[PDB]
Amino acid sequence: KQFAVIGLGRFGGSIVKELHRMGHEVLAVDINEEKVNAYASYATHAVIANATEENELLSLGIRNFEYVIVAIGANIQASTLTTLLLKELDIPNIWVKAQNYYHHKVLEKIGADRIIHPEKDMGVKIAQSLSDENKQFAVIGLGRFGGSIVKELHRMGHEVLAVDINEEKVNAYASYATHAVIANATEENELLSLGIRNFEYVIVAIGANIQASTLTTLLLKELDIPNIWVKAQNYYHHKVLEKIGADRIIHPEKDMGVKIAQSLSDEN
Amino acid sequence: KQFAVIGLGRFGGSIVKELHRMGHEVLAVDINEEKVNAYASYATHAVIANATEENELLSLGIRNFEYVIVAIGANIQASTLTTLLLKELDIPNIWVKAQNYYHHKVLEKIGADRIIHPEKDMGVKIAQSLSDENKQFAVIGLGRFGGSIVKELHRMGHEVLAVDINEEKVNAYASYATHAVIANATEENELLSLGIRNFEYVIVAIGANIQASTLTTLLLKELDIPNIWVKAQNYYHHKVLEKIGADRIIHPEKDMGVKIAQSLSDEN
Amino acid sequence: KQFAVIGLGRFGGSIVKELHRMGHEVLAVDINEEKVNAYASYATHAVIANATEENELLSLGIRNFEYVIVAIGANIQASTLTTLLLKELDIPNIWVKAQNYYHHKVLEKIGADRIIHPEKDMGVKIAQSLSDENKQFAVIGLGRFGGSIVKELHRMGHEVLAVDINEEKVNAYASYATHAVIANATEENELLSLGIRNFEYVIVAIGANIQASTLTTLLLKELDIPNIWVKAQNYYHHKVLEKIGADRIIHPEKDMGVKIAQSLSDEN
Amino acid sequence: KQFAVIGLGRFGGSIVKELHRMGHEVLAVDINEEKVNAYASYATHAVIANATEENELLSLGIRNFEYVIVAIGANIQASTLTTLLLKELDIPNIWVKAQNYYHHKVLEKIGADRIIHPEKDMGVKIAQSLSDENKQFAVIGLGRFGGSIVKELHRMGHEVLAVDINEEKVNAYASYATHAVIANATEENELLSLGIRNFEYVIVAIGANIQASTLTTLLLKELDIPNIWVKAQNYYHHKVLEKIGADRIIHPEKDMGVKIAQSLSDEN
Amino acid sequence: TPPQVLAIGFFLTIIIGAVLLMLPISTTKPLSWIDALFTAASATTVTGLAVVDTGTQFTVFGQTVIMGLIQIGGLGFMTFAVLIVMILAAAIGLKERMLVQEALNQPTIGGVIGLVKVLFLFSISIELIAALILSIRLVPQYGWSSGLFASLFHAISAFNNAGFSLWPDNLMSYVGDPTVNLVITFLFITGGIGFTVLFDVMKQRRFKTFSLHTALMLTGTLMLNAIAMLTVFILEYSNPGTLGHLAAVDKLWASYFQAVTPRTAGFNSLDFGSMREGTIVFTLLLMFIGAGSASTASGIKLTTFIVILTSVIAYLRGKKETVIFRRSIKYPIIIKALAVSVTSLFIVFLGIFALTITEQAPFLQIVFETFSAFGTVGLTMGLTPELTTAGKCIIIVIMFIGRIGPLTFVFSFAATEQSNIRYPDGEVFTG
Amino acid sequence: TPPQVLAIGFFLTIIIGAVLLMLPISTTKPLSWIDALFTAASATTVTGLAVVDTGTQFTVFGQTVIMGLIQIGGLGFMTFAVLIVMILAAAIGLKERMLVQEALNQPTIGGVIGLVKVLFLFSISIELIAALILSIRLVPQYGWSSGLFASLFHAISAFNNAGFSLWPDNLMSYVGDPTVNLVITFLFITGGIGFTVLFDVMKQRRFKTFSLHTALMLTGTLMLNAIAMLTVFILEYSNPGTLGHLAAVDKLWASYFQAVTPRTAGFNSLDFGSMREGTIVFTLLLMFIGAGSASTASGIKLTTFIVILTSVIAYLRGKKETVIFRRSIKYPIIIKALAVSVTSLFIVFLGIFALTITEQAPFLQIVFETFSAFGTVGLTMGLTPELTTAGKCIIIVIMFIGRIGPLTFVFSFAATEQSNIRYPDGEVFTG
Ligand SMILES: [K+]
Ligand SMILES: [K+]
């Protein structure tokens, strides 16, 4: 019944927006006000505060909330200390957004009732969408997301043509995919020589350099790729990728929040 | 009759390709071979050499060519020294691609029979295409190209809403346009507040950062801008900008070469 | 009696070296082997292992050690998770090297029997050395170290001419020093205009850019500054600063380890 | 009798300062005023102007000067166009500072009565100082300067242990020195293994990264190297290198100007 | 909203109160419709002017309702609106926290509800102990029916910088009274200095640990007063009318008080209608510049002056920046200072202009009246009683605009416009 | 140096000239040592004040030497020092080019020698053709001994904005003279607008291609005059003393001229000693703000006003920057404007203060005299002749400081200090 999300990042913001949509009270709150302002009408209560300060957690009657969500990215200590303080107020169910592997472990020994990996957990879901969607699978960009799909699909037992720009990643994924390949998705001859045309499902998970994500999907749409799924970064990336011909765009942080906002709702 | 183009850059390449099309002998030649290879069937004679070396100019019977074209970009000294050597062989008409203003002057005292500014000279032509095309004119990005259009259109006597990201340029163009504005074409409120919607002809000349060129045209197409003309950088930029809704795309270097390839042809 | 130091950084290395000197058993151990190698004869037992793995902590009979030292810098999670695992093996007294403020808090709720701030805790000691050393005090570079001296000296009740390159820090130290000044120690006129010549004790705590630390001390020695104390980074910094005329050089990480290696010794 | 130096760079500044010292009229002049200001009492006439503009050359009665010096570095076109304009006013003897090889050629076809390579021409002089100074020769850093010494000394017939950080240069100097070696002067084992201790004359010509120049000389002085000659960059580099034990410091740009200021004086 | 609320809101306390006194109970002689909406506005603005006398015209009902109006604005309009929600209810969100941040000049909103208790409570604190105790020391003369009241009525007016005196002789009767000059001055002085300097010196209490602002006030405050006592004493020394013939000690109680009362105090130790022309001048400027920010009334707070002036003192030299007490002053403070500066003047000028024609009165008095009117100074060269009707409505606006501050007042009916696009440089000379 | 030179230099033309007229040849009646170093300083400053009448007291020698002094400063002090090195010699380095860049308000030094010829030559150009031709049209009445001179003497004073009239009735005799009001107004108006707007409109001549500054002047200049003629006409309409009884057409020649003469013109179409108090007021402000930068005289040039005011108008709204004619105004122009603004006031106040005690005169006249004195306006409520000695020395400094501009004047004895080190933020309220 009592919902409160700390940290209005892309993830923490996609939960205060979804829960409010469904019609559930959401005590949104972030460190600064820049975000807290845009979410003044996206939550039951928009508050500007720092989750590391005790008096701020108390004064906000945060103790009445059975479901606390620590979505503060970056500064891991911010994510930790918060969950740490939360577990002290005997918060029933604390859900936290971990960054790396160790964040998972540490947050697990603190008392985190649940940890979510936006990039990771999403890939597995997509790896489930591509499977129930039909044969030829290929994922470009072995980032955290693109890596969680080559790992999941291979698990299920589906051919996955994994491939990233450098080899550092392609090496660790030599036995995590049907075919590990080191190449650059922007070069034509490399896309052709890789018989990428035989793949009905192409996944552009290359983060950072948006142009890399775009140009790739651009080249892909030229080879008449049946269904191209791409990982967009910001809003505009969505638009541009949509006019290119992207058969599907995924927002790891965004799309995940809505799912959690559904897990916290059906949880009571 | 005798045609020879030095430097197979984007410009020097659009001339060896065009002249060969018309059916005129073209002694294409660049410093390295990377380009000279792709132009083996795009010119009467593909040669790999350095225009600064004497023996290489002589051995290539370059003296028999009445029309020499120095399109070697970058290293200005390469462009200069070449024209310098050329003028020594009493080359009838030497046409050279100047980079900056001073390049114009120096190349003029050397004996350059003709100097071309791909970016500059092209803008004036477009400024002529937009004029004979019909009222509301606005050019985004005051680069060399975008600056040669706000200067020409204002000359003709047409309203030009000049505007660039910073102010450094917008300042020098305060009396070169109906309205000099300092703004960023990626921000919505800035496009709206500038009543950019009343302009039937928008010109995105922002070079470098392609995304800047794209996103802008993207926003423009949203305001239902009648005719949006954009300056593309590379091939892919052409494609992507074409799927966005760009009413027209211009390649300063490319489109200019074809025109010159027409000036050298009708010149004899 | 049982001593073991995890993480052979500059700090963790200055403790395994000092304790072994005194004649105390030291179970040195770092993640990689690069360091563990050079410390094969600097500790009772040099071991290559990762403090986050359980089986590695157990197999190393780490449970028999009453004094565990987590000096692993950088990756805070490494520092945390370790102390976390340590507190599970009921380690009597766990001493950990915290990085930032929050690291202090979190490490405090885990069970850290002691936390040390190499940069911070050292400054206070020096602020005690400069006080018992005699009037005019001035500290350049408000880093973590240079900031812990302007704060301590002002506490005792001594004039402190705090001053850093930018203003970001100089602002937070407006009421933490007799005089907060924003300036660059490399410029002469700025050193003069600040009457820095009247200061018998100058402290160059500017980290990072060694040249900044050097050139400053260099300029300082020219104004015939009585006693110039400088914060050296690496070994060579020590040498070069020594030939310049540095009246005193301090290694926050190094010099602190020896002190702790003295606290652990006299502690039993 | 009539002396005028254009471009107050490090070189052009060491000539207006030296000639004025001797007691000769010097029409100092640079593009901006920043330099022209500090040289108001270092020349018969300090003028702020641009050598590319005609009216500025005329209005400055530059035609009355028999000796014009174009020391404007960087923008080669500035160095060229100037000499170009100068040769038009029938300037008796125009001396210009060339940057690279091609600058030499082009400036030679313009009419440059003399071209000087500060870095190059200086090395040959030093290569003459080290020769008449006495057996074991070794030059570190194959920059333009360090390269003009390994080339000159080998010419005379003296053993030269050439050596630079990378191999790119060390390759072209395989037959330009008694022993071409690829190494980093900051590493000890590399200095020892190269029997550098047997060399009575070590030359640190590594430009850029001053620390490289310093640390090296620092290590050198430790091996008790008889006479260490180092290439300093700025003023402070001089001081610091002087307190390290540098048996000699050379300022390619500076020391050369004084020599030229001696050539122009004895030239009439 | 924060601005408007203090605009139209403070406007009602004047109207409502303009009838709370125009009532047959508080008025002996007929109170014309004009001389009623005035005197009621002067007290609420803590200005010090009145068409009709005080202690006389008004009964014990018209003298008590004046203390209530002189208190309302004595701390601001929102300083009493957030105190009626904590002693009767409790708990207040970030919706009302943005209102008292505009009635006491505060750059912070996240914490202005809890203070509400302290301010008013602390108000009636130093107001009682310094009035009914230290001011009833030498005033019990008139008995208890006029000694108990007259000693409590002037404190709520003294500490609040009001200028509303009971007896017709606006304190003019106590020329050299040691208790008066000492007791009342301490009231409007401190009560005059921004609440900051008030609160600051309290918990800080350190001779050095005083913030730029607080540290400023004390210096400028005292320092200036010295230049004030020196001026009044040098010009009104031989003046046979006032001070000129007073003894040796009584001459200091006049120069001092008269050099401290222009600080929007409103008390007369002598008479301004009989002093060297020069003196009156220095005053127009001495009353123009109020005293303190959070203060308790003023047209252009002392701080503004210092900044504007000193900031210019730096220009004439070279300092690329305006640095005070080795704690430089950011750029913003400059522009705002200028704004608040030119505004007060631009307006006061509009008044001096819209009055010289409205009523046939001298010029010196027409200018002295305006400056004092916009700065709620209280000192009147004897033109307040003889103010026509036409010149009243407008004058009522002056005091209204002056007390409400030219800035926080203009933000109300000012459609805030946000420019997102920059423009080309605009060269222009002014030397 | 650039500043000092114009400071102590312009100071000598006043002294040397104060003896060029005190000579028995140019003075009929004895010219006291006091009323000699004054009238000679008023003409050189082109101020419009004089202890002794003009056309009378002075002979043909005391009326010719006045036109020479009214010309010297009519273009600046360094506008005549670089004109004696090109017509007699030629060639000038970058050493003297930095002096005329401070006497005509120029942000450039690399080119102020060549112009020297044009300025003065162009001066005596419009001064002759508009005086001996258009001003000798309706003045040949007094014959050739007084019709030829009287028509040339007023132009060197009209175009230069001087206020020095021949006949005792400072043009007051020509109330509705079409030639006078039309001829002389065009002289001090244009001569008044900065040399820029003068030179600009010349080669530019385009209705749009006028730089920010130039474009400004024209608008503000004319626009303001409209508010000026409207003011003087509405207040002095029924005034039986002046204009009030003039016909229908003669009422416009008074309102117009009187609304254009305060621009440091110095001519009287009527009498300021007999006009509604309100009118005189608007004037103090209308004469405070001069007219144009490069102009020919003024205390605080029009431009400064616009900026300061408008800049504030932007604050009350929101525009993060002060943008004019869609050509934003850089930050610097703001601070300097403020400086020049507060300076003129701070000083004029020091005068109005140091005069009310020096001489027993009315207050309205003591303030009108000061503003006019610092802005070399020429209009005097009839107190100039009755100026005591004590109030003269100081008054001579006013006109001196005003004409020399408060900025370029303060840079002389101002030890320029350069701060290289920054300091911590300094919070301070002022609302
Ligand atoms: K008052
Ligand atoms: K005048």
PDB file of C-alpha atoms in Angstrom, chain E residues 21-152:
ATOM      1  CA  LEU E  21     -10.107  53.182  14.103  1.00  0.00           C
ATOM      2  CA  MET E  22     -12.599  55.236  12.085  1.00  0.00           C
ATOM      3  CA  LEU E  23     -15.112  53.805  14.563  1.00  0.00           C
ATOM      4  CA  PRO E  24     -16.918  56.256  16.922  1.00  0.00           C
ATOM      5  CA  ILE E  25     -15.228  54.507  19.859  1.00  0.00           C
ATOM      6  CA  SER E  26     -11.615  55.309  18.957  1.00  0.00           C
ATOM      7  CA  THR E  27     -12.328  58.731  17.471  1.00  0.00           C
ATOM      8  CA  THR E  28     -13.320  61.774  19.521  1.00  0.00           C
ATOM      9  CA  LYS E  29     -13.563  64.469  16.858  1.00  0.00           C
ATOM     10  CA  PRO E  30     -15.056  63.512  13.462  1.00  0.00           C
ATOM     11  CA  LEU E  31     -12.491  61.528  11.478  1.00  0.00           C
ATOM     12  CA  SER E  32     -12.915  62.538   7.831  1.00  0.00           C
ATOM     13  CA  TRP E  33     -13.081  59.698   5.314  1.00  0.00           C
ATOM     14  CA  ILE E  34      -9.668  60.899   4.144  1.00  0.00           C
ATOM     15  CA  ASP E  35      -7.822  61.260   7.456  1.00  0.00           C
ATOM     16  CA  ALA E  36      -8.913  57.752   8.442  1.00  0.00           C
ATOM     17  CA  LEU E  37      -7.604  55.511   5.662  1.00  0.00           C
ATOM     18  CA  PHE E  38      -4.320  57.375   6.139  1.00  0.00           C
ATOM     19  CA  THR E  39      -3.343  57.302   9.818  1.00  0.00           C
ATOM     20  CA  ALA E  40      -4.429  53.657   9.795  1.00  0.00           C
ATOM     21  CA  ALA E  41      -2.042  52.952   6.922  1.00  0.00           C
ATOM     22  CA  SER E  42       0.854  54.860   8.479  1.00  0.00           C
ATOM     23  CA  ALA E  43       0.844  52.681  11.595  1.00  0.00           C
ATOM     24  CA  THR E  44       0.579  49.419   9.654  1.00  0.00           C
ATOM     25  CA  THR E  45       3.472  50.610   7.500  1.00  0.00           C
ATOM     26  CA  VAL E  46       5.275  51.807  10.604  1.00  0.00           C
ATOM     27  CA  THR E  47       5.960  55.046   8.705  1.00  0.00           C
ATOM     28  CA  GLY E  48       5.547  57.851  11.232  1.00  0.00           C
ATOM     29  CA  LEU E  49       3.105  60.208   9.519  1.00  0.00           C
ATOM     30  CA  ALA E  50      -0.477  61.159  10.377  1.00  0.00           C
ATOM     31  CA  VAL E  51      -3.061  63.661   9.159  1.00  0.00           C
ATOM     32  CA  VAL E  52      -4.452  63.897  12.684  1.00  0.00           C
ATOM     33  CA  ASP E  53      -2.525  63.911  15.970  1.00  0.00           C
ATOM     34  CA  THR E  54      -2.070  60.692  17.956  1.00  0.00           C
ATOM     35  CA  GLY E  55      -2.474  60.752  21.739  1.00  0.00           C
ATOM     36  CA  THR E  56      -5.249  63.325  21.361  1.00  0.00           C
ATOM     37  CA  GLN E  57      -7.627  62.627  18.453  1.00  0.00           C
ATOM     38  CA  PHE E  58      -7.645  58.917  19.300  1.00  0.00           C
ATOM     39  CA  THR E  59      -9.020  57.414  22.509  1.00  0.00           C
ATOM     40  CA  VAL E  60      -7.593  54.395  24.346  1.00  0.00           C
ATOM     41  CA  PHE E  61      -9.185  52.439  21.494  1.00  0.00           C
ATOM     42  CA  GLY E  62      -7.529  54.400  18.703  1.00  0.00           C
ATOM     43  CA  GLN E  63      -4.159  54.147  20.422  1.00  0.00           C
ATOM     44  CA  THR E  64      -4.257  50.396  21.040  1.00  0.00           C
ATOM     45  CA  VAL E  65      -5.381  49.471  17.529  1.00  0.00           C
ATOM     46  CA  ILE E  66      -2.389  51.471  16.311  1.00  0.00           C
ATOM     47  CA  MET E  67       0.046  49.269  18.239  1.00  0.00           C
ATOM     48  CA  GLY E  68      -1.493  46.210  16.626  1.00  0.00           C
ATOM     49  CA  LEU E  69      -1.008  47.638  13.144  1.00  0.00           C
ATOM     50  CA  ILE E  70       2.523  48.810  13.928  1.00  0.00           C
ATOM     51  CA  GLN E  71       3.290  45.239  14.992  1.00  0.00           C
ATOM     52  CA  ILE E  72       1.818  43.427  11.979  1.00  0.00           C
ATOM     53  CA  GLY E  73       4.299  44.979   9.568  1.00  0.00           C
ATOM     54  CA  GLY E  74       6.996  45.346  12.195  1.00  0.00           C
ATOM     55  CA  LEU E  75       8.250  41.899  11.219  1.00  0.00           C
ATOM     56  CA  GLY E  76       6.639  41.533   7.809  1.00  0.00           C
ATOM     57  CA  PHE E  77       3.305  40.370   6.411  1.00  0.00           C
ATOM     58  CA  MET E  78       4.127  36.648   6.325  1.00  0.00           C
ATOM     59  CA  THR E  79       5.755  36.758   9.753  1.00  0.00           C
ATOM     60  CA  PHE E  80       2.294  36.571  11.327  1.00  0.00           C
ATOM     61  CA  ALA E  81       0.582  34.283   8.810  1.00  0.00           C
ATOM     62  CA  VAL E  82       2.690  31.218   9.626  1.00  0.00           C
ATOM     63  CA  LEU E  83       2.373  31.672  13.385  1.00  0.00           C
ATOM     64  CA  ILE E  84      -1.349  30.966  13.394  1.00  0.00           C
ATOM     65  CA  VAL E  85      -0.841  27.468  11.989  1.00  0.00           C
ATOM     66  CA  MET E  86       1.599  26.084  14.572  1.00  0.00           C
ATOM     67  CA  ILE E  87       0.099  27.245  17.867  1.00  0.00           C
ATOM     68  CA  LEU E  88      -3.386  26.145  16.800  1.00  0.00           C
ATOM     69  CA  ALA E  89      -2.578  23.199  14.536  1.00  0.00           C
ATOM     70  CA  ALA E  90       0.980  22.133  13.589  1.00  0.00           C
ATOM     71  CA  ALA E  91       2.807  20.670  10.579  1.00  0.00           C
ATOM     72  CA  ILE E  92       3.336  22.625   7.356  1.00  0.00           C
ATOM     73  CA  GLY E  93       4.491  21.453   3.935  1.00  0.00           C
ATOM     74  CA  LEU E  94       6.726  23.092   1.340  1.00  0.00           C
ATOM     75  CA  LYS E  95       3.708  25.090   0.156  1.00  0.00           C
ATOM     76  CA  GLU E  96       3.692  27.702   2.925  1.00  0.00           C
ATOM     77  CA  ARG E  97       7.449  27.513   3.475  1.00  0.00           C
ATOM     78  CA  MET E  98       7.865  29.622   0.328  1.00  0.00           C
ATOM     79  CA  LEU E  99       5.908  32.569   1.721  1.00  0.00           C
ATOM     80  CA  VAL E 100       7.888  33.645   4.786  1.00  0.00           C
ATOM     81  CA  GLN E 101      10.966  33.390   2.577  1.00  0.00           C
ATOM     82  CA  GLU E 102       9.607  36.546   0.947  1.00  0.00           C
ATOM     83  CA  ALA E 103       8.444  38.443   4.048  1.00  0.00           C
ATOM     84  CA  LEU E 104      11.758  38.434   5.914  1.00  0.00           C
ATOM     85  CA  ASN E 105      14.059  38.316   2.904  1.00  0.00           C
ATOM     86  CA  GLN E 106      15.273  34.719   2.963  1.00  0.00           C
ATOM     87  CA  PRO E 107      17.029  32.762   0.185  1.00  0.00           C
ATOM     88  CA  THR E 108      15.733  29.495   1.655  1.00  0.00           C
ATOM     89  CA  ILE E 109      12.220  28.042   1.841  1.00  0.00           C
ATOM     90  CA  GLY E 110      12.892  24.618   3.327  1.00  0.00           C
ATOM     91  CA  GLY E 111      12.575  25.867   6.881  1.00  0.00           C
ATOM     92  CA  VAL E 112      10.550  28.962   7.706  1.00  0.00           C
ATOM     93  CA  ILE E 113       7.678  27.404   9.637  1.00  0.00           C
ATOM     94  CA  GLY E 114       9.541  26.423  12.789  1.00  0.00           C
ATOM     95  CA  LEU E 115      11.150  29.851  13.159  1.00  0.00           C
ATOM     96  CA  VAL E 116       7.733  31.520  13.078  1.00  0.00           C
ATOM     97  CA  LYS E 117       7.376  30.754  16.795  1.00  0.00           C
ATOM     98  CA  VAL E 118      10.715  32.287  17.784  1.00  0.00           C
ATOM     99  CA  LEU E 119      10.380  35.536  15.819  1.00  0.00           C
ATOM    100  CA  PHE E 120       7.041  36.777  17.211  1.00  0.00           C
ATOM    101  CA  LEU E 121       7.662  35.276  20.644  1.00  0.00           C
ATOM    102  CA  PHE E 122      11.075  36.940  20.696  1.00  0.00           C
ATOM    103  CA  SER E 123       9.319  40.088  19.496  1.00  0.00           C
ATOM    104  CA  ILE E 124       6.871  40.516  22.376  1.00  0.00           C
ATOM    105  CA  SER E 125       9.881  39.487  24.465  1.00  0.00           C
ATOM    106  CA  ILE E 126      12.210  42.470  24.100  1.00  0.00           C
ATOM    107  CA  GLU E 127       9.136  44.656  23.547  1.00  0.00           C
ATOM    108  CA  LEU E 128       7.738  44.079  27.038  1.00  0.00           C
ATOM    109  CA  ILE E 129      10.894  43.851  29.153  1.00  0.00           C
ATOM    110  CA  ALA E 130      12.290  47.003  27.535  1.00  0.00           C
ATOM    111  CA  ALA E 131       9.007  48.918  27.689  1.00  0.00           C
ATOM    112  CA  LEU E 132       6.982  48.088  30.784  1.00  0.00           C
ATOM    113  CA  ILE E 133      10.215  47.832  32.776  1.00  0.00           C
ATOM    114  CA  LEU E 134      12.862  50.212  31.426  1.00  0.00           C
ATOM    115  CA  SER E 135      10.458  52.699  29.826  1.00  0.00           C
ATOM    116  CA  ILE E 136       8.092  52.825  32.795  1.00  0.00           C
ATOM    117  CA  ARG E 137      11.007  53.966  34.954  1.00  0.00           C
ATOM    118  CA  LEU E 138      10.762  57.693  34.257  1.00  0.00           C
ATOM    119  CA  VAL E 139       7.243  57.774  32.795  1.00  0.00           C
ATOM    120  CA  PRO E 140       5.142  56.715  35.827  1.00  0.00           C
ATOM    121  CA  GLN E 141       4.688  60.461  36.331  1.00  0.00           C
ATOM    122  CA  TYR E 142       1.366  60.813  34.495  1.00  0.00           C
ATOM    123  CA  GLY E 143       0.063  58.163  36.871  1.00  0.00           C
ATOM    124  CA  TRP E 144      -0.975  54.622  35.975  1.00  0.00           C
ATOM    125  CA  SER E 145      -3.716  55.503  33.483  1.00  0.00           C
ATOM    126  CA  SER E 146      -1.180  57.234  31.242  1.00  0.00           C
ATOM    127  CA  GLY E 147       2.109  55.996  32.653  1.00  0.00           C
ATOM    128  CA  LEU E 148       1.440  52.301  32.100  1.00  0.00           C
ATOM    129  CA  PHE E 149       0.146  52.756  28.550  1.00  0.00           C
ATOM    130  CA  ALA E 150       2.432  55.541  27.313  1.00  0.00           C
ATOM    131  CA  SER E 151       5.379  53.348  28.312  1.00  0.00           C
ATOM    132  CA  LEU E 152       4.140  50.300  26.401  1.00  0.00           C
TER     133      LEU E 152
END
